[PDB]
Amino acid sequence: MFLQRPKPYSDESLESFFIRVANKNGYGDVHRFLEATKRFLQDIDHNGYQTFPTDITRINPYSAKNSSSARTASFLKLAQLTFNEPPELLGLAINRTNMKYSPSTSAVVRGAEVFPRSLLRTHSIPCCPLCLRENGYASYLWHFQGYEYCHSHNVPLITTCSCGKEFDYRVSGLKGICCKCKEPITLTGHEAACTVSNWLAGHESKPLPNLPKSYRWGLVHWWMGIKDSEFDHFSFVQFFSNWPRSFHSIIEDEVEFNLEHTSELRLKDLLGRLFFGSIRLPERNLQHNIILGELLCYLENRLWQDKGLIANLKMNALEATVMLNCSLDQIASMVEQRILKPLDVTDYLFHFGDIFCLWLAEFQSDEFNRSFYV
Amino acid sequence: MFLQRPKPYSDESLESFFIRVANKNGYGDVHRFLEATKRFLQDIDHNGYQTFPTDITRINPYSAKNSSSARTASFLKLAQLTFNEPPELLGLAINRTNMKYSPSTSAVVRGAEVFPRSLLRTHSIPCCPLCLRENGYASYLWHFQGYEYCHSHNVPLITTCSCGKEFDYRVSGLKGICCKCKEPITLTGHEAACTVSNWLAGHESKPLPNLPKSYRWGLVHWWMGIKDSEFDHFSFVQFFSNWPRSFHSIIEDEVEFNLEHAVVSTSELRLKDLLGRLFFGSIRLPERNLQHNIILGELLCYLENRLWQDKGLIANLKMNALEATVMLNCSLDQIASMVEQRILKPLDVTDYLFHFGDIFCLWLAEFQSDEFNRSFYV
Ligand SMILES: [Zn+2]
Ligand SMILES: [Zn+2]
Ligand SMILES: [Zn+2]
Ligand SMILES: [Zn+2]
């Protein structure tokens, strides 16, 4: 099998790429192309040829149950041999990853960007028909929730045609023609959703902060946890218009709520929601995680105020490893040599001011250290 | 106790800062200032006041054995109370850290920069007397090996006066006057050491790569491991003048050397028997961020286009379960789980049951991150 690479685009999704390779190389559809691709992987003795799908929907490596390592070996084999000039196909796929969010949400990764798993669309993929007839392909941003408007046309996305039928471009091509009525779909204008769509796309959108793309999706997942509901585009832009003193206003109202509802107060009894729900979003890089960077800025100037209220909050050995980013073996070693001053791992024997100053002594890094929020 | 902050400088060392606070606040030396500082920490009921040293040599928190957590609480207490305007003193100290280098070298951290532990000077600290009489303080770069010339005066550092006596600024002040002869020290000019000194200082030095300061010291420790000797300033700049095709020339010569001298059947070849030196000596320098670790980023670039060439020579290299966790950055509990559900295809942990091409593609499937992923060396 010998193929031709189409016009490359670094924002094209993986399912939109196989349609354009099949249409350029004269195949009938993408079902035929993947079935002929599985035939080629059999002929050169690939170990997981039989797990290569003929369905466009399950092509991505998060779809594969145990073929995840054989799927990316299959994707790396095709880009090196079957093309006149080697394409980029691993950079368009959505891989699983071991990275977790706060508190326990898993994640997926696409090239140089990490997405939340819960914000991945799985029922029906919306689309913009203006991009389908100008760019000629589909973007990866249509697979994730929150991205509701087009960042370059300011038009809302479509999930249903005028005849009640849905339109999925993976099964109905890239042209924009419906299946039942075989007609182009008629379109269905705000500003707050347009700003977030231009912000999630990777461009500078004010007043939203200039963050890497892995961190911009972490704030959207974090904002859905604060309101404890779905994502609101209006209150999200307004919250960062008063940055950082709007985020300071919440933490004051949370500690006034939990004090009224004192030497026995724990860290999970006063700051159990804000602190543990902001550690890994996606990681502890305080240069880019502005939520954990500002929360540690607020708790630094309040350690020994109010007779040491914050610095005397009790902690376990489990939740000490979450803050210090270490293991229970190093915690049990630091009670042997007693760098950390007092074993039951679920026992409250440590104070927050001692854990905060142990981090400034033995557990800083080049990314998780205090020198960014100064 | 009420003190005055001197002129602040973000490159001043910690031992040079306490001398300038004591000289501004009218103390006699730094020995009577730290001893008066220990007296203040006793008066406000600090838990580790009795471990606060009166020696300026052991003022850094890596010198404290068990009281390293009490030392940084002592440093955080002084900056908040005893000054008219709060200084920055935790940012000048040299803390220990849990970060290891390759293969097993420990590390220290100073603010936003991680240093190798073995490159930390412990016998005698050299100095530049021109910076002592112009800037008025000392820099932290004088505490680390490799930094041999001044990056702004291009003069070699001094460890010995003209009368045979050493000059340590921690015990002899910041002026530049010797102890025996009480005279200023007479100085003792290349280019290759001047480039590395301007590169380790944090400025752009060509042809050396634009890296963060935590990674620039990692290359110097790595270059001492390749030659298996001390650091050479001439061959270091020349090696990055032919980047990356000079580093490609070594890996070709290593796999040709190892294959010819292999003691086992070409199919029984292991990853430690062919690439045991280059791969395991480049994982954590300091970490796996392939955006800035250009050694591991280029070694995985070279081994990607050679997996199934030569009848799958690289992709059939045997690995253990121990050295699978080093590459995947995981634990032995997740490895034992992936032999239960069999995402990874075959328990004795020191047994060679896995191939390198399967571990490399399992990483592209289940173990990428925002920093350790393939999308940087494309
Ligand atoms: Zn659009
Ligand atoms: Zn229709
Ligand atoms: Zn200079
Ligand atoms: Zn002299």
Numbering used by the authors:
A (entry chain I): 1 to 188, 193 to 265, 270 to 350, 360 to 391
B (entry chain J): 1 to 188, 193 to 350, 360 to 391
Tell me what the authors wrote about this structure, in their words:
Recently, bioinformatics analyses have revealed the presence of CRISPR–Cas loci in bacterial Tn7-like transposons, thereby implicating a functional relationship between RNA-guided DNA targeting and transposition, with the latter representing a new role unrelated to host defense. Support for this concept has emerged from recent functional studies on type I-F and type V-K effectors involved in sequence-specific DNA transposition, thereby significantly broadening the potential biological applications of CRISPR–Cas technology. To complement the available functional studies, our efforts have focused on structural studies of the Vibrio cholerae Tn6677 multi-subunit type I-F CascadecrRNA–TniQ complex, whereby transposition subunit TniQ initiates DNA transposition with the eventual help of other transposition-associated proteins TnsA, TnsB and TnsC in the gene cluster. Here we report cryo-EM structures of a V. cholerae type I-F CascadecrRNA in complex with transposition subunit TniQ before (binary CascadecrRNA–TniQ) and after (ternary CascadecrRNA–TniQ–dsDNA) target double-stranded DNA (dsDNA) binding at an average resolution of 2.9 Å and 3.2 Å, respectively.
Cas6 and TniQ can be readily traced in the 2.9 Å structure of the binary complex, thereby providing insights into how the three Cas subunits (Cas8, Cas7, and Cas6) of the multi-subunit type I-F Cascade are assembled in an intertwined helical topology with crRNA and TniQ. The complex is assembled with a 60-nucleotide (nt) crRNA processed by the CRISPR-specific endoribonuclease Cas6 from long precursor CRISPR transcripts (pre-crRNA), which contains 28-nt repeat sequences separated by 32-nt plasmid- or phage-derived spacer sequences. Cas6 binds to the 3′ stem-loop of crRNA, while forming multiple polar interactions with Cas7.1 (left insert).
